[PDB]
Amino acid sequence: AFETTTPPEPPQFPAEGKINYVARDTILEFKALPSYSEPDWITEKFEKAGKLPPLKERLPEEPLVYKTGNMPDGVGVYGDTMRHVVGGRPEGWNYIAGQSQGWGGIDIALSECLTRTAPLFQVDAKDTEPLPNLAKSWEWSEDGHTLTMHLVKGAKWSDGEAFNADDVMFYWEDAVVDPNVSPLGGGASPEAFGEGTTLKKIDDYTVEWTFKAAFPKQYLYTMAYPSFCPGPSHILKPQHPKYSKNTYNQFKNAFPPEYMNMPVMGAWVPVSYRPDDLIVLRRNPYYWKVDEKGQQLPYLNEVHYKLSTWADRDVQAVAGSGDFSNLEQPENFVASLKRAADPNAPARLAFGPRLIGYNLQMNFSANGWGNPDERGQAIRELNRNEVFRQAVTSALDRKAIGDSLVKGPFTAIYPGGISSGTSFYDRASTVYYPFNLEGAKAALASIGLKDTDGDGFLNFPKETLGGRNVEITLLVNNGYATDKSLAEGLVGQMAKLGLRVVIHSLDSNQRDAAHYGGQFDWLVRRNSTELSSVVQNTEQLAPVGPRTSWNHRSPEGKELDLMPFEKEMADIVRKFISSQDNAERADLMKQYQKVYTQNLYTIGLTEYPGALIVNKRFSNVPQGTPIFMFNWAEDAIIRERLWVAADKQGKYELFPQQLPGKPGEGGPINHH
Numbered sequence: 001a002f003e004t005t006t007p008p009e010p011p012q013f014p015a016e017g018k019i020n021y022v023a024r025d026t027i028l029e030f031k032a033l034p035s036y037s038e039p040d041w042i043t044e045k046f047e048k049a050g051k052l053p054p055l056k057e058r059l060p061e062e063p064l065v066y067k068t069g070n071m072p073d074g075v076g077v078y079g080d081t082m083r084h085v086v087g088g089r090p091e092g093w094n095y096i097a098g099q100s101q102g103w104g105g106i107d108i109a110l111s112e113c114l115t116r117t118a119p120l121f122q123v124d125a126k127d128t129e130p131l132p133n134l135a136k137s138w139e140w141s142e143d144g145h146t147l148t149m150h151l152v153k154g155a156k157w158s159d160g161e162a163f164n165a166d167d168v169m170f171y172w173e174d175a176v177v178d179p180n181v182s183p184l185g186g187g188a189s190p191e192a193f194g195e196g197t198t199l200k201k202i203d204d205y206t207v208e209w210t211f212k213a214a215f216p217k218q219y220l221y222t223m224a225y226p227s228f229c230p231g232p233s234h235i236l237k238p239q240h241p242k243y244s245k246n247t248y249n250q251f252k253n254a255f256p257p258e259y260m261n262m263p264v265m266g267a268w269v270p271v272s273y274r275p276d277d278l279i280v281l282r283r284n285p286y287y288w289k290v291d292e293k294g295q296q297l298p299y300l301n302e303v304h305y306k307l308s309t310w311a312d313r314d315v316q317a318v319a320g321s322g323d324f325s326n327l328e329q330p331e332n333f334v335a336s337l338k339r340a341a342d343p344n345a346p347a348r349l350a351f352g353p354r355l356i357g358y359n360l361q362m363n364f365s366a367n368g369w370g371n372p373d374e375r376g377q378a379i380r381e382l383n384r385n386e387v388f389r390q391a392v393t394s395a396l397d398r399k400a401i402g403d404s405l406v407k408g409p410f411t412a413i414y415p416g417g418i419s420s421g422t423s424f425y426d427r428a429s430t431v432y433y434p435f436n437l438e439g440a441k442a443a444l445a446s447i448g449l450k451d452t453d454g455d456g457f458l459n460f461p462k463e464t465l466g467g468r469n470v471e472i473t474l475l476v477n478n479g480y481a482t483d484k485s486l487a488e489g490l491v492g493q494m495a496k497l498g499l500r501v502v503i504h505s506l507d508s509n510q511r512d513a514a515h516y517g518g519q520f521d522w523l524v525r526r527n528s529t530e531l532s533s534v535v536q537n538t539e540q541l542a543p544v545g546p547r548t549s550w551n552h553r554s555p556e557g558k559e560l561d562l563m564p565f566e567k568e569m570a571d572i573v574r575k576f577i578s579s580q581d582n583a584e585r586a587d588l589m590k591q592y593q594k595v596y597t598q599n600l601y602t603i604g605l606t607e608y609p610g611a612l613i614v615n616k617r618f619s620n621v622p623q624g625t626p627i628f629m630f631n632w633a634e635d636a637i638i639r640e641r642l643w644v645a646a647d648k649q650g651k652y653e654l655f656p657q658q659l660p661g662k663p664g665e666g667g668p669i670n671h672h
C-alpha cells in the first residue's frame with residue numbers, strides 16, 4: 001500500500017582525514033630478531049636485581065613484529081600515559097563469562113583474540129584475510145572443511161604462565177560450547193562459528209577447526225574481537241562449575257573489580273581500582289609484540305580509565321585532560337568542533353564516513369524468548385505482521401529525527417540495513433518507506449487496530465487482551481544522550497500514529513541482560529560491526545543460528561520460528577560466508593539489503609559520521625582512522641604502537657617504574 005523508493009542522497013561530507021590504503025601484510029609478521037630491548041628501568045631495577053627474567057626469556061622465540069613501513073611516524077620511544085575517560089563501570093574481570101570491564105577500550109586492551117581486524121580499515125582490497133594475532137598462521141584443507149591453526153609459540157600471560165592451545169580449548173569448550181556461559185557482547189554462541197563446527201587440539205600450539213560448509217573463510221573474522229578472546233585458563237578453570245563446586249553465577253563473579261593483576265595477553269595489566277573514580281593499568285612485562293628494532297611494546301608505560309560519563313569523554317579530550325574520544329553523540333558535535341577550531345587546541349578532531357547508525361529492533365520471537373506474558377505475546381504477534389512494520393516505519397519523519405540530533409550535513413535518511421558509508425552498500429537495493437502518517441494510520445486500521453475508548457491510542461480488537469489499548473515497551477541504554485533523545489522522539493512519533501510506547505531505561509549491564517534474555521517488545525540500539533562493515537561478525541546479519549540475531553532468538557533449546565524472509569536472509573548470509581567470488585559477494589549483499597529493507601528486519605532511525613579525537617602529542621596515530629568500522633578506534637589505532645616524543649611527554653604516571661604484581665595481590669610492585 002506504500003509508495004516505496006530509494007533513500008535520497010545525503011549532503012556531501014568533506015570527510016576530513018583520508019585513509020592511506022596499504023596491503024594486508026604491511027602491518028606485522030612473526031619472526032625472531034637478533035636482539036631485544038625494553039625501558040632502561042626494567043633492565044636496571046628488575047632484571048639486574050634478579051626480580052624479573054631477561055627480556056629474551058620472557059618473549060616468544062618468534063614474537064609478533066610490527067613493520068616500520070606501516071607506522072605513520074616510524075619506530076617509537078618509551079614513556080608516557082594514555083588517559084582514557086569512560087561512561088561504563090567494571091563488574092569484574094571475567095570477560096569470557098560475560099562481565100563488562102566498563103567499555104571505552106578497557107576490555108579491547110585486555111582481551112587479545114585469535115585474529116585482529118580493526119586495523120583493516122586501511123586495506124581497500126577484496127577480500128582481506130584477518131590479521132594473525134594469537135593465531136600466527138592457518139591453512140585450509142584441499143576440500144575446505146578443515147582449518148589448521150598455528151598459535152604464537154612461547155608467549156606468556158602477564159603472570160608468566162605459558163599461553164598455548166589449553167587456553168584456546170578452555171574458551172571453546174567451557175565458554176562457547178557450554179550453554180550456561182555467555183561471553184561479553186551477546187555473541188559467541190557455537191553457531192556463530194557455523195552450525196556443527198568443531199574445534200580440537202592437535203598439540204600445544206596447534207588447533208584444528210572442522211566446518212560443515214567448504215571454505216567458510218568469513219569465520220576468521222569471528223575469531224577476532226569480541227567473539228574469540230581467550231581467558232587465562234589456569235586462573236579461570238579452577239572456578240568453572242565443571243571442575244569445582246562453584247555455581248555458574250559464582251564462576252562469573254569469582255574475579256570482582258577489586259581483584260588486581262588479572263592475567264592477560266594484552267599490552268597493560270590492571271594494577272589499581274578506585275570505585276566510580278579510576279582504573280590504572282601498567283605495562284605487561286610478558287607482552288609478545290615488538291617493533292623492527294627489537295623494542296618490546298607497548299611504548300606507553302601506563303593507561304588510565306577515568307570512570308565518568310560518555311559525554312565527559314568528549315569534554316575531557318577537547319580540553320586536553322583526556323587523551324582520546326569517539327565523538328559519536330551529535331548533541332556534542334557543535335561544542336566539540338568549536339573547541340577543536342582553536343589552533344592552540346590540545347587535540348585533533350577528524351570525521352570519517354557515515355558508519356554510526358541507530359535502529360529500532362522489534363522482538364520477532366513468538367515461541368517464548370524472554371518468556372513473555374499475554375500482553376508481551378500479543379506484541380510479538382504485531383511485530384511479526386508485515387503491515388504493522390510498514391505502518392511503524394512510514395510513521396517516522398526521518399528528516400525530523402536527524403534534525404532533532406544535529407543540523408547541517410551530518411545525518412542521512414536511514415531506512416535500516418547496511419550503512420551508506422560501507423563498500424557493500426547499494427542505494428538502489430535500499431527500500432525507503434517515505435513519511436506517510438495517513439497511510440500508516442490506514443494500514444493499522446486494516447489489521448484491526450482502532451481507537452474504541454476515545455483516548456487517541458489504538459486498541460486491540462475485542463478478541464485480543466479484552467480490547468485494551470496497544471502498549472509497547474521500549475528498551476533504552478540510559479548511558480547515552482543520543483539513545484534517550486531517539487527513544488523520546490520515537491514515543492512522540494508513535495503517539496501521532498496512535499501507538500502508546502513506554503520507555504524502559506536501564507544501565508548498560510541491565511540493558512544487555514534484558515536484551516539477550518529476550519525481555520523486550522522493542523529496543524533502540526546503536527549498530528554493531530555487521531552493519532558498518534558486513535565482513536565482521538557476519539552471522540549477526542541474520543538468524544543463521546538460534547542465538548545469532550539481535551532481535552530473533554529462540555529459548556534454550558527450541559528451534560527458531562522464522563518468517564519466510566528471515567530464512568531467505570539466513571540463506572544469503574550462509575552463501576556469502578562461503579563465497580570467495582567478489583562479484584557474487586557484492587550481488588549477495590544487494591539481495592540481502594533488498595530483503596532486509598523491504599521486509600523491515602529492523603527499522604532505521606538515523607545515521608551519521610563520528611569523529612576521532614586524539615591528543616596532539618601522540619605519534620603513530622593512522623590518518624583517517626574511523627571511530628567504528630571493523631571495531632572501535634581504540635582497537636584500530638593500535639594503542640601498543642602509539643608513542644610520544646621525549647620532549648612532548650606528559651608526566652602523568654601514577655606508578656612510574658612499577659610493574660604488575662601477582663594475581664589477587666595488593667597492586668603493583670616496585671624495585672625498593
Ligand SMILES: OC[C@H]1O[C@H](OC[C@H]2O[C@H](O)[C@H](O)[C@@H](O)[C@@H]2O)[C@H](O)[C@@H](O)[C@H]1O
Pocket residue numbers: 103104105106108185310326328508528632634
Ligand atoms: O568498547 C569501546 C566502546 O565503548 C563504548 O561503547 C560500548 C558499546 O560497544 C560494544 O561494541 C558493545 O557491543 C555494546 O554493548 C556497548 O554498549 C563507547 O560508546 C564507544 O565509543 C567505544 O569507546
Ligand SMILES: [Mg+2]
Pocket residue numbers: 161162164166167233234
Ligand atoms: Mg595453561
Ligand code: NA
Pocket residue numbers: 141142143144
Ligand atoms: Na582435503
Ligand code: NA
Pocket residue numbers: 165166167169170233
Ligand atoms: Na583446556
Ligand code: NA
Pocket residue numbers: 197198199200
Ligand atoms: Na567441538
Ligand code: NA
Pocket residue numbers: 241246247248249
Ligand atoms: Na549453576
Ligand code: NA
Pocket residue numbers: 089090274275276277307
Ligand atoms: Na566503579
Ligand code: NA
Pocket residue numbers: 218219220221222535536537538539
Ligand atoms: Na564474521
